[PDB]
Each structure stands twice: as C-alpha cells, then as structure tokens.
Amino acid sequence: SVLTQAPSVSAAPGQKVTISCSGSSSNIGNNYVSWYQQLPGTAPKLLIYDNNKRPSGIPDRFSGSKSGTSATLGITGLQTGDEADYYCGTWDSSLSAVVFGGGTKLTVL
Amino acid sequence: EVQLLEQSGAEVKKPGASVRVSCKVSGYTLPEVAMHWVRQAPGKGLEWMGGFDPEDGETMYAQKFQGRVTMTEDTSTDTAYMELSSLRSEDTAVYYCATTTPFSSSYWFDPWGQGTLVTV
Amino acid sequence: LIVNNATNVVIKVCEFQFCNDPFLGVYYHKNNKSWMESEFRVYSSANNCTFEYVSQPFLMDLEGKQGNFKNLREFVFKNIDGYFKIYSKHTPINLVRDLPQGFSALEPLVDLPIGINITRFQTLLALHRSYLTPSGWTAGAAAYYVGYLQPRTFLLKYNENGTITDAVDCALDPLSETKCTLKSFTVEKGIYQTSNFRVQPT
C-alpha cells in the first residue's frame, strides 16, 4: 500500500537471507513493526512483533531490526516449507490507522 | 491460549446486497480484547479495515473505507458484526477478523479468524 | 458467599451452584477502562437467595510501604445459635512469613441471622487475563493461614481502655491451669493447687 517491499525474492535452501521494508518517520519511525506469513489460501500468521519479539511457536532462527525508517525481517535457516509471502506493518498516525506493504513472496530455490 | 470462531462462514451475496460479518471468540470474553479487520484480495495484499483504537477508546474505521462499513458488539454472546455496504467491483475479497490487546500499544493482530471471502 | 469488591462487599447468604474450581475472575471492561470482576467463575446459578447484606470493605489496603507491614489480616468465623459472627483485624508484620508473639484482638463485625450449619468451605480468589507472551492466570503469589477453633477457658485482661492484651488458656499446660485459679497474670512464689487428676479405666 503506502510502504515499500518487492513482490518476490528467491534464494537457495538452507541459506541465510533476509527481507526488508522501507517506511517513513510518519509510520515506522515512531512506531513498532510487525511481520506476517501466509501460505496459499491460508491464515496469515504473525511472524515477529516489535521486530525483536517472537510469538509462541516461532523458530528462534528469525530476528529483526529497525534502522531509521528501514525495518529488516531476519530470515535464517531457509527451509523447503518456508516459501510464502511476508508482510510488513506498523502503526500509522498519518491516516491514524493500520498500514501494510504489498507483500513479498519468498521462494526457496 | 485462545482459538476463535469463524469470521462469517461462506457468505455469497450477488450484486445489490450487503453483508454483516459476525466474529465470535472462545477462551476469552469479547470486551477484554479488541477486534480488527483487514481486506485481503486473492492474489493481492493486505488492506486494514474496521478495528478498535486502544487510545481514545473508540472503535476505529479506516478513513478510505470509512462510512461504508460499521461495527457493533454483543459482549455476552461475543458477536461482533461487521456490516459492509454498497457492493462494488474490487470489494469482493477475504476480510480477516483480527485482534489486538487493549494492553497496551499492540499493533500486531494476534490469533485471527481463518478468513472469509465476500461477494459483489 | 462473602464477596469483597472494588469496594462494596456484598455478603450473600443464598443457594448457589459452586463450580469444581470456584474463584472470582477479573478482567478489563474496555468501557470506562475499569477492571470488572466476573463473579460467575465462582458459581453458575444464583437463585432462591435467603439473605443479602452490604457493608464497608473488611479487606482494606494501605500500602505505599514497600513492605514492612505486609498488612497482616485475620478473620475469625464462628457459627453458633443462629448468629454467624465475623471478626477482623489489621496488623503490620516485618517478618518474612509467619506470625509474631503479639496479641491480636478481633472485634465482631456483624452478628447475622444465618441459621445454617456450615461443615465445609474453601476460599476465593481474584485472577485476571494476560495477552500474548511466551491465557494469563494466578496474579502474584498467594498464601494464607488456617486453624480450627475449640472450646477453651481464657482469662481475659482488659486494659484501662478495654484493649485486651494478655490472654491465657487454662488447659494449655499444668502451669497454665493454676494461673486461671489465681485469675492473675502474676503468680507469687509458692505452691498452688491446680485441679485434681484421675486415673481413667482401661
């Protein structure tokens, strides 16, 4: 929507590569970031909240960071079942609402 | 912790209609936790919708979609009705029941409602 | 059913259905930003009720003290002659857990027409809900003290203001039974004749 991330990305299995989302000070700057996963026709699953915190049942192999308006979702230990789209979001005071990016569909090569 | 009830069920309503969305819960009670809504169009991304505001105590409405969709709550029966109106072309899609926690600043939508497509 | 609230305790003498694991649930209303108390997590049905009453809260805090009080709170419950009477007290205690050597005088709170025999009971609890962390329950820690009553003869020493300090049981030991004969807490040097003993038949 109002945020920046690519449609798709690809990498070899078992490797280490992350995905980032570029916001602004009006959105990511003062606000906490979340990340979500969905399989085709399934229930989008919370990945990491506040970029540093794992929900119950999340592999510890995921991390996160926020540098200025840029927020990277740490993705490590690629699995054959890790191919799916990951969504960035953070609170917005601009329209005073919840915003997301277009989504990035990972591919494990 | 908690599993939820479905968002709607299967609601197929031909053009010239409008549809409520009643999302119930289990393991919690309705007004200890705030609900939320997101448009998800197949082959597309997330568009947030509805929602409750931890600040100010109001139930939010997405400005872009404001006024077309409304929400009510029955606390005892845990029924939260999301009524979308005035069907249009691109507005048939999965609209997820989501929730944040009133304590405190949570932006993350937490265990959610499995998804329901609508029909225009 | 004694329920303490935020703030009107509503004593209840009724006919309820108490669950297998009764206790008072507490949650957050989101309307007026107030922590309510779900009272039916204790009991399902409330009906037929015989009696109802309300008073100023027996349970009371002070706090601001970062401990050093612990606000030790005692309640005595005695069911006799149609009057089940409640007693209370509030005391500072600096010890880690257990009780000091001091005397605790408990005034009767209310003398109520109860007319029922109570042979068994359990306490009540206040717990709440939490949200996603690696549902929430068991707020803080909880421990208390229980002991059973018994008929005994006490000598009661009132003060100039009627505040009883020293009490002495007569049957506690062969020494305690003589002090009940002199009625005095001072026992002068000498020999005193305590109640007789008998050998009993096998």
Short mmCIF file of C-alpha atoms in Angstrom, two decimals:
data_model
loop_
_atom_site.label_atom_id
_atom_site.label_comp_id
_atom_site.label_asym_id
_atom_site.label_seq_id
_atom_site.Cartn_x
_atom_site.Cartn_y
_atom_site.Cartn_z
CA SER A 1 0.00 0.00 0.00
CA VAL A 2 1.87 3.01 1.33
CA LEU A 3 5.04 1.04 2.20
CA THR A 4 7.93 -0.39 0.19
CA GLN A 5 8.80 -4.02 -0.44
CA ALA A 6 9.24 -6.12 -3.55
CA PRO A 7 6.75 -8.66 -4.95
CA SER A 8 9.08 -11.67 -4.76
CA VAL A 9 12.55 -12.86 -3.78
CA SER A 10 14.38 -16.16 -4.22
CA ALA A 11 17.25 -17.98 -2.54
CA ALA A 12 18.79 -21.45 -2.23
CA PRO A 13 17.64 -23.72 0.62
CA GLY A 14 19.32 -23.78 4.00
CA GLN A 15 20.94 -20.41 3.29
CA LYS A 16 20.72 -17.09 5.17
CA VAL A 17 18.96 -14.12 3.54
CA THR A 18 16.55 -11.57 4.98
CA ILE A 19 13.80 -9.24 3.76
CA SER A 20 13.47 -5.52 4.50
CA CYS A 21 10.63 -2.99 4.37
CA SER A 22 11.20 0.74 3.86
CA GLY A 23 8.82 3.08 5.68
CA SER A 24 8.92 6.67 6.84
CA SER A 25 9.25 8.56 10.12
CA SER A 26 5.48 9.06 9.94
CA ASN A 27 4.97 5.28 10.11
CA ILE A 28 7.98 3.13 11.05
CA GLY A 29 9.93 5.94 12.71
CA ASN A 30 7.95 6.29 15.94
CA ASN A 31 6.01 3.01 15.73
CA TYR A 32 6.64 -0.68 16.30
CA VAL A 33 6.78 -3.08 13.35
CA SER A 34 5.13 -6.47 12.84
CA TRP A 35 5.58 -9.21 10.26
CA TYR A 36 3.17 -11.81 8.95
CA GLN A 37 3.26 -15.06 6.96
CA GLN A 38 0.56 -16.71 4.85
CA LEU A 39 0.59 -19.87 2.78
CA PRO A 40 -1.60 -20.03 -0.36
CA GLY A 41 -5.24 -19.72 0.65
CA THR A 42 -4.39 -19.90 4.37
CA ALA A 43 -4.38 -17.90 7.60
CA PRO A 44 -1.75 -15.14 7.72
CA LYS A 45 0.47 -15.88 10.69
CA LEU A 46 2.15 -13.33 12.91
CA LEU A 47 5.91 -13.71 12.46
CA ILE A 48 7.67 -11.16 14.70
CA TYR A 49 6.23 -8.29 16.74
CA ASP A 50 8.22 -5.18 17.67
CA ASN A 51 10.85 -6.79 15.38
CA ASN A 52 12.61 -8.17 18.48
CA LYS A 53 9.88 -10.45 19.85
CA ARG A 54 8.84 -13.93 18.78
CA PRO A 55 5.26 -15.16 19.19
CA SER A 56 4.72 -18.56 20.76
CA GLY A 57 5.72 -21.30 18.33
CA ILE A 58 8.10 -19.25 16.16
CA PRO A 59 11.55 -20.70 15.38
CA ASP A 60 14.22 -18.67 17.14
CA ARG A 61 16.06 -18.51 13.80
CA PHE A 62 14.09 -15.36 12.95
CA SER A 63 15.28 -11.92 14.06
CA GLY A 64 14.58 -8.30 13.20
CA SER A 65 15.94 -4.78 13.19
CA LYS A 66 14.78 -1.20 12.74
CA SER A 67 17.30 1.27 11.29
CA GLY A 68 15.68 4.68 10.91
CA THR A 69 12.75 4.29 8.55
CA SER A 70 14.03 0.88 7.40
CA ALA A 71 12.97 -2.36 9.08
CA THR A 72 14.52 -5.70 8.15
CA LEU A 73 12.95 -9.06 8.98
CA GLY A 74 15.70 -11.51 9.89
CA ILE A 75 15.23 -14.74 7.96
CA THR A 76 17.71 -17.56 8.57
CA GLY A 77 17.94 -21.31 8.14
CA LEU A 78 15.85 -21.48 4.99
CA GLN A 79 13.52 -24.48 4.76
CA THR A 80 11.69 -26.12 1.90
CA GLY A 81 8.48 -25.15 3.68
CA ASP A 82 9.48 -21.51 4.12
CA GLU A 83 8.21 -20.35 0.71
CA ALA A 84 5.41 -17.83 1.29
CA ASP A 85 4.74 -14.10 1.38
CA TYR A 86 5.90 -11.97 4.31
CA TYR A 87 4.13 -8.70 5.14
CA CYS A 88 5.50 -5.68 6.98
CA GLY A 89 3.26 -3.46 9.05
CA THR A 90 3.48 -0.72 11.65
CA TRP A 91 1.10 1.75 13.24
CA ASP A 92 0.28 4.86 11.23
CA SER A 93 -0.62 8.20 12.76
CA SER A 94 -0.84 9.85 9.33
CA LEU A 95 -4.26 8.46 8.47
CA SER A 96 -4.32 7.26 12.11
CA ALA A 97 -4.74 3.63 11.11
CA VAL A 98 -3.01 0.34 10.36
CA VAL A 99 -0.89 0.09 7.21
CA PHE A 100 0.91 -2.68 5.32
CA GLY A 101 3.17 -3.19 2.36
CA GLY A 102 2.29 -5.03 -0.81
CA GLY A 103 3.95 -8.22 0.40
CA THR A 104 6.99 -10.17 -0.72
CA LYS A 105 6.61 -13.77 -1.82
CA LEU A 106 9.76 -15.68 -0.88
CA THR A 107 10.96 -18.60 -2.99
CA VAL A 108 13.31 -21.27 -1.64
CA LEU A 109 15.41 -22.41 -4.59
CA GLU B 1 -4.34 -19.66 24.98
CA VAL B 2 -7.29 -18.97 22.68
CA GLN B 3 -8.92 -20.16 19.48
CA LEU B 4 -11.59 -18.06 17.80
CA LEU B 5 -14.84 -18.68 16.00
CA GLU B 6 -15.06 -18.09 12.28
CA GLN B 7 -15.45 -14.62 10.83
CA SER B 8 -18.61 -15.25 8.81
CA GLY B 9 -18.86 -18.59 7.24
CA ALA B 10 -19.37 -18.66 3.49
CA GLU B 11 -21.32 -15.52 2.54
CA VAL B 12 -22.12 -15.23 -1.16
CA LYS B 13 -24.29 -12.22 -1.94
CA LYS B 14 -24.96 -11.22 -5.55
CA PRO B 15 -24.62 -7.54 -6.52
CA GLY B 16 -27.30 -5.38 -4.99
CA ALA B 17 -26.77 -6.62 -1.42
CA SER B 18 -24.76 -6.04 1.76
CA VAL B 19 -23.35 -8.41 4.35
CA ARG B 20 -22.66 -8.38 8.09
CA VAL B 21 -19.63 -10.24 9.45
CA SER B 22 -20.03 -11.74 12.93
CA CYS B 23 -16.76 -12.90 14.51
CA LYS B 24 -17.03 -14.76 17.80
CA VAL B 25 -14.30 -15.95 20.16
CA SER B 26 -13.51 -18.74 22.60
CA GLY B 27 -11.36 -18.87 25.73
CA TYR B 28 -11.71 -15.12 26.16
CA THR B 29 -14.68 -12.82 26.62
CA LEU B 30 -15.46 -10.31 23.90
CA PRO B 31 -14.77 -6.95 25.62
CA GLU B 32 -11.47 -7.85 27.24
CA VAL B 33 -9.75 -7.70 23.84
CA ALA B 34 -10.14 -5.52 20.76
CA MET B 35 -11.05 -6.78 17.30
CA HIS B 36 -9.73 -5.63 13.92
CA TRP B 37 -10.34 -6.19 10.23
CA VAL B 38 -8.18 -6.40 7.12
CA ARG B 39 -9.12 -6.59 3.47
CA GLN B 40 -7.24 -9.35 1.68
CA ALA B 41 -7.92 -9.76 -2.01
CA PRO B 42 -6.74 -13.07 -3.54
CA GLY B 43 -3.51 -12.65 -5.45
CA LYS B 44 -3.13 -9.30 -3.68
CA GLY B 45 -2.04 -7.84 -0.35
CA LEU B 46 -3.42 -6.57 2.94
CA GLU B 47 -5.72 -3.58 3.38
CA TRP B 48 -6.58 -2.86 7.01
CA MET B 49 -10.16 -2.20 7.99
CA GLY B 50 -12.52 -1.61 10.89
CA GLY B 51 -10.59 -2.06 14.10
CA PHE B 52 -10.73 -0.75 17.66
CA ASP B 53 -8.49 2.01 19.00
CA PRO B 54 -6.59 1.34 22.25
CA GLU B 55 -6.21 5.10 22.59
CA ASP B 56 -9.33 7.27 22.91
CA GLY B 57 -11.38 4.08 23.37
CA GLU B 58 -13.17 4.44 20.04
CA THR B 59 -13.73 1.67 17.52
CA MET B 60 -11.70 2.81 14.52
CA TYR B 61 -12.91 2.92 10.94
CA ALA B 62 -10.43 3.02 8.07
CA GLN B 63 -10.67 6.51 6.61
CA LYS B 64 -10.52 5.32 3.00
CA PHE B 65 -13.38 2.90 3.69
CA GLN B 66 -14.96 4.99 6.46
CA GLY B 67 -18.74 5.23 6.47
CA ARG B 68 -19.31 2.24 4.19
CA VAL B 69 -18.64 -0.36 6.90
CA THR B 70 -19.85 -0.31 10.50
CA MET B 71 -19.34 -2.47 13.59
CA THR B 72 -21.43 -3.40 16.63
CA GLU B 73 -20.71 -5.65 19.62
CA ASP B 74 -22.68 -8.01 21.85
CA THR B 75 -20.43 -8.57 24.84
CA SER B 76 -22.14 -11.64 26.32
CA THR B 77 -22.59 -13.61 23.09
CA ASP B 78 -19.20 -12.41 21.76
CA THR B 79 -20.81 -11.44 18.43
CA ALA B 80 -19.12 -8.55 16.61
CA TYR B 81 -20.94 -7.69 13.39
CA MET B 82 -19.03 -6.09 10.53
CA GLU B 83 -21.53 -4.74 8.00
CA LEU B 84 -20.11 -3.72 4.64
CA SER B 85 -22.49 -1.99 2.25
CA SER B 86 -22.86 -0.77 -1.33
CA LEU B 87 -21.13 -3.58 -3.19
CA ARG B 88 -18.55 -2.56 -5.80
CA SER B 89 -16.19 -4.25 -8.28
CA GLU B 90 -12.95 -4.82 -6.34
CA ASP B 91 -14.52 -5.11 -2.89
CA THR B 92 -15.22 -8.85 -3.01
CA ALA B 93 -12.38 -10.43 -1.03
CA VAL B 94 -11.35 -12.18 2.19
CA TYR B 95 -11.83 -9.88 5.17
CA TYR B 96 -9.97 -11.21 8.20
CA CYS B 97 -11.15 -10.94 11.79
CA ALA B 98 -8.10 -9.82 13.76
CA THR B 99 -7.46 -8.68 17.33
CA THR B 100 -5.06 -6.60 19.35
CA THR B 101 -4.79 -6.38 23.03
CA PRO B 102 -6.01 -3.29 24.89
CA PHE B 103 -2.86 -3.57 26.98
CA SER B 104 -1.32 -1.68 25.58
CA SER B 105 0.19 -0.33 22.35
CA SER B 106 -0.13 -3.57 20.37
CA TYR B 107 -0.14 -3.14 16.61
CA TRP B 108 0.05 -6.89 15.90
CA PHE B 109 -3.15 -8.65 15.01
CA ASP B 110 -2.69 -11.79 17.08
CA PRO B 111 -4.66 -15.05 16.60
CA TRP B 112 -7.20 -14.32 13.89
CA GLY B 113 -10.25 -15.68 12.09
CA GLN B 114 -9.24 -18.05 9.21
CA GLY B 115 -10.65 -15.65 6.58
CA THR B 116 -13.94 -15.21 4.72
CA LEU B 117 -14.47 -14.19 1.09
CA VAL B 118 -17.41 -11.95 0.22
CA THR B 119 -19.38 -11.50 -2.99
CA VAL B 120 -20.32 -8.48 -5.10
CA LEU C 1 -20.93 -16.28 49.88
CA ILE C 2 -18.74 -13.44 51.05
CA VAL C 3 -17.65 -11.30 48.10
CA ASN C 4 -15.30 -8.31 48.60
CA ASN C 5 -15.45 -5.84 45.65
CA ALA C 6 -13.95 -2.56 44.44
CA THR C 7 -15.45 -1.56 47.14
CA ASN C 8 -18.85 -2.71 48.41
CA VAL C 9 -18.50 -6.21 49.84
CA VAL C 10 -21.91 -7.80 49.15
CA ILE C 11 -22.19 -10.53 51.74
CA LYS C 12 -24.54 -13.18 50.37
CA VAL C 13 -26.39 -15.98 52.11
CA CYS C 14 -28.15 -17.75 49.24
CA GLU C 15 -28.40 -21.03 47.35
CA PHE C 16 -25.75 -21.18 44.63
CA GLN C 17 -24.14 -23.73 42.35
CA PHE C 18 -20.43 -23.66 43.12
CA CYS C 19 -18.19 -24.97 40.37
CA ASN C 20 -15.45 -27.57 40.75
CA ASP C 21 -12.73 -24.85 40.78
CA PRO C 22 -14.53 -21.73 42.03
CA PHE C 23 -12.87 -18.30 42.24
CA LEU C 24 -13.64 -14.74 41.17
CA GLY C 25 -12.49 -13.87 37.68
CA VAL C 26 -11.27 -10.34 36.99
CA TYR C 27 -10.95 -8.84 33.52
CA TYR C 28 -10.76 -5.46 31.79
CA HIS C 29 -14.03 -3.91 30.53
CA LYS C 30 -12.56 -1.53 27.82
CA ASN C 31 -15.73 0.54 28.51
CA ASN C 32 -14.81 3.22 31.15
CA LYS C 33 -11.36 1.48 31.35
CA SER C 34 -12.37 -0.42 34.55
CA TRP C 35 -11.34 -3.87 35.82
CA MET C 36 -14.59 -5.71 36.43
CA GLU C 37 -14.97 -8.93 38.37
CA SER C 38 -16.75 -11.85 36.75
CA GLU C 39 -18.46 -13.44 39.74
CA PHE C 40 -19.86 -16.49 37.97
CA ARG C 41 -16.42 -18.01 37.53
CA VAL C 42 -17.10 -18.93 41.16
CA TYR C 43 -20.65 -20.18 40.85
CA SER C 44 -23.03 -20.81 37.96
CA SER C 45 -26.51 -20.36 39.45
CA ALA C 46 -27.66 -17.69 41.88
CA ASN C 47 -31.27 -18.13 43.00
CA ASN C 48 -33.59 -18.91 45.94
CA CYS C 49 -31.45 -16.49 47.95
CA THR C 50 -32.29 -16.25 51.65
CA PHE C 51 -30.19 -13.28 52.77
CA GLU C 52 -28.21 -10.34 51.42
CA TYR C 53 -26.13 -7.61 53.05
CA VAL C 54 -23.60 -4.89 52.22
CA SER C 55 -21.01 -3.12 54.38
CA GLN C 56 -17.72 -1.22 54.25
CA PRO C 57 -14.91 -3.41 52.95
CA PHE C 58 -13.44 -5.78 55.51
CA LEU C 59 -10.40 -6.33 53.29
CA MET C 60 -8.63 -2.98 53.14
CA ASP C 61 -5.28 -1.83 51.84
CA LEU C 62 -2.92 0.96 52.90
CA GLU C 63 0.31 0.18 51.04
CA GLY C 64 2.83 2.78 49.89
CA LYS C 65 5.01 0.95 52.44
CA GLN C 66 7.19 -1.25 50.15
CA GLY C 67 6.53 -3.97 52.70
CA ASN C 68 7.48 -3.76 56.38
CA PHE C 69 3.75 -4.06 57.05
CA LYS C 70 2.54 -6.88 54.77
CA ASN C 71 -0.82 -5.77 56.18
CA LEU C 72 -1.42 -8.97 58.09
CA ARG C 73 -5.17 -9.56 58.02
CA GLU C 74 -7.08 -12.02 60.19
CA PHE C 75 -10.68 -13.15 60.07
CA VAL C 76 -12.44 -15.41 62.56
CA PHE C 77 -15.62 -17.24 61.62
CA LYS C 78 -17.79 -18.85 64.31
CA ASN C 79 -21.22 -20.32 63.61
CA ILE C 80 -23.48 -20.66 66.66
CA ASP C 81 -27.05 -20.08 67.85
CA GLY C 82 -28.32 -18.63 64.59
CA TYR C 83 -25.59 -15.97 64.68
CA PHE C 84 -22.56 -16.50 62.48
CA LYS C 85 -20.32 -13.63 63.56
CA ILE C 86 -17.32 -12.22 61.72
CA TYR C 87 -14.19 -10.83 63.33
CA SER C 88 -11.31 -8.88 61.80
CA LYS C 89 -8.02 -7.09 62.45
CA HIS C 90 -5.19 -5.41 60.56
CA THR C 91 -1.61 -5.61 61.72
CA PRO C 92 1.86 -4.66 60.47
CA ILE C 93 4.35 -7.52 60.30
CA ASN C 94 8.03 -7.20 59.36
CA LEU C 95 8.76 -10.94 59.48
CA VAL C 96 9.20 -12.84 56.23
CA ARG C 97 6.13 -15.07 56.62
CA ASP C 98 4.95 -16.48 59.93
CA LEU C 99 3.32 -14.78 62.90
CA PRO C 100 4.81 -12.70 65.75
CA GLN C 101 4.39 -13.02 69.52
CA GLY C 102 1.90 -10.15 69.77
CA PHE C 103 -1.76 -10.36 70.74
CA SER C 104 -4.46 -9.66 68.16
CA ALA C 105 -7.87 -8.54 69.38
CA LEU C 106 -10.73 -9.05 66.92
CA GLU C 107 -13.95 -7.14 67.26
CA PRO C 108 -17.20 -8.66 65.96
CA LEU C 109 -18.04 -7.04 62.66
CA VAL C 110 -21.67 -8.09 62.14
CA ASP C 111 -23.77 -10.57 64.09
CA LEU C 112 -26.02 -12.07 61.41
CA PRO C 113 -29.05 -14.42 61.37
CA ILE C 114 -27.51 -17.34 59.42
CA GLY C 115 -29.35 -20.34 60.88
CA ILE C 116 -27.38 -22.80 58.71
CA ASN C 117 -24.77 -25.32 59.78
CA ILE C 118 -21.59 -24.90 57.73
CA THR C 119 -19.45 -28.05 57.75
CA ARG C 120 -17.09 -27.26 54.85
CA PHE C 121 -15.73 -24.40 52.76
CA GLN C 122 -12.98 -23.05 50.51
CA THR C 123 -11.56 -19.55 49.97
CA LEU C 124 -12.00 -17.32 46.92
CA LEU C 125 -9.51 -15.78 44.53
CA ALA C 126 -9.02 -12.87 42.16
CA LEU C 127 -7.16 -13.67 38.93
CA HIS C 128 -7.03 -12.00 35.52
CA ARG C 129 -6.15 -12.37 31.85
CA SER C 130 -2.89 -11.71 30.04
CA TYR C 131 -2.06 -11.34 26.35
CA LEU C 132 0.45 -12.72 24.00
CA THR C 133 3.71 -13.53 25.78
CA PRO C 134 5.82 -16.71 25.68
CA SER C 135 -4.14 -17.35 28.90
CA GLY C 136 -2.58 -15.40 31.82
CA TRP C 137 -3.68 -16.53 35.33
CA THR C 138 -2.52 -16.69 39.02
CA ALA C 139 -1.74 -12.95 39.55
CA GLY C 140 1.17 -12.65 42.03
CA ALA C 141 1.59 -15.15 44.84
CA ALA C 142 -1.00 -16.26 47.38
CA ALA C 143 -0.68 -17.91 50.79
CA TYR C 144 -2.71 -17.82 53.98
CA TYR C 145 -3.14 -19.36 57.42
CA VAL C 146 -5.95 -21.57 58.72
CA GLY C 147 -6.62 -23.13 62.10
CA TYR C 148 -9.66 -24.66 63.76
CA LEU C 149 -11.39 -23.36 66.86
CA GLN C 150 -12.08 -25.29 70.06
CA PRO C 151 -13.77 -24.68 73.43
CA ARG C 152 -11.25 -23.38 75.96
CA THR C 153 -11.34 -21.22 79.08
CA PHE C 154 -9.37 -18.00 78.66
CA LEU C 155 -8.61 -15.40 81.28
CA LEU C 156 -9.01 -12.02 79.60
CA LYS C 157 -7.02 -9.00 80.76
CA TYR C 158 -8.65 -5.78 79.60
CA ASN C 159 -6.70 -2.54 79.59
CA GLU C 160 -7.71 0.84 81.09
CA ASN C 161 -9.23 1.43 77.58
CA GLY C 162 -10.64 -2.15 77.36
CA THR C 163 -7.96 -3.28 74.84
CA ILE C 164 -7.24 -6.93 75.76
CA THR C 165 -3.55 -7.73 75.70
CA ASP C 166 -2.75 -10.80 77.80
CA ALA C 167 -4.97 -13.84 77.41
CA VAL C 168 -4.13 -17.21 78.97
CA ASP C 169 -5.57 -20.62 78.22
CA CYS C 170 -6.30 -22.74 81.27
CA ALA C 171 -5.86 -26.21 79.75
CA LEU C 172 -2.65 -25.30 77.81
CA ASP C 173 -0.26 -26.89 80.35
CA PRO C 174 -0.38 -27.84 84.10
CA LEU C 175 1.22 -24.43 84.67
CA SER C 176 -1.43 -22.50 82.74
CA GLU C 177 -4.33 -24.04 84.68
CA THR C 178 -3.15 -22.61 88.03
CA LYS C 179 -2.97 -19.03 86.67
CA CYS C 180 -6.68 -19.46 85.95
CA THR C 181 -7.18 -20.35 89.60
CA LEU C 182 -5.48 -17.16 90.85
CA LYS C 183 -7.08 -15.14 87.97
CA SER C 184 -3.78 -13.20 87.96
CA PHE C 185 -1.02 -12.94 85.39
CA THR C 186 1.39 -12.52 88.29
CA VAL C 187 1.92 -15.77 90.17
CA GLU C 188 3.53 -15.30 93.56
CA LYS C 189 6.33 -17.58 94.67
CA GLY C 190 4.82 -20.63 96.29
CA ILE C 191 2.79 -23.78 95.74
CA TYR C 192 -0.73 -23.66 94.35
CA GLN C 193 -3.25 -26.45 93.98
CA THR C 194 -4.42 -26.90 90.39
CA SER C 195 -7.41 -29.06 89.51
CA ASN C 196 -7.21 -32.70 90.51
CA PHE C 197 -6.37 -35.54 88.17
CA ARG C 198 -7.82 -39.03 87.96
CA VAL C 199 -6.59 -42.24 86.53
CA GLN C 200 -9.09 -43.44 84.00
CA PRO C 201 -10.33 -47.02 83.28
CA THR C 202 -8.85 -49.13 80.52
#
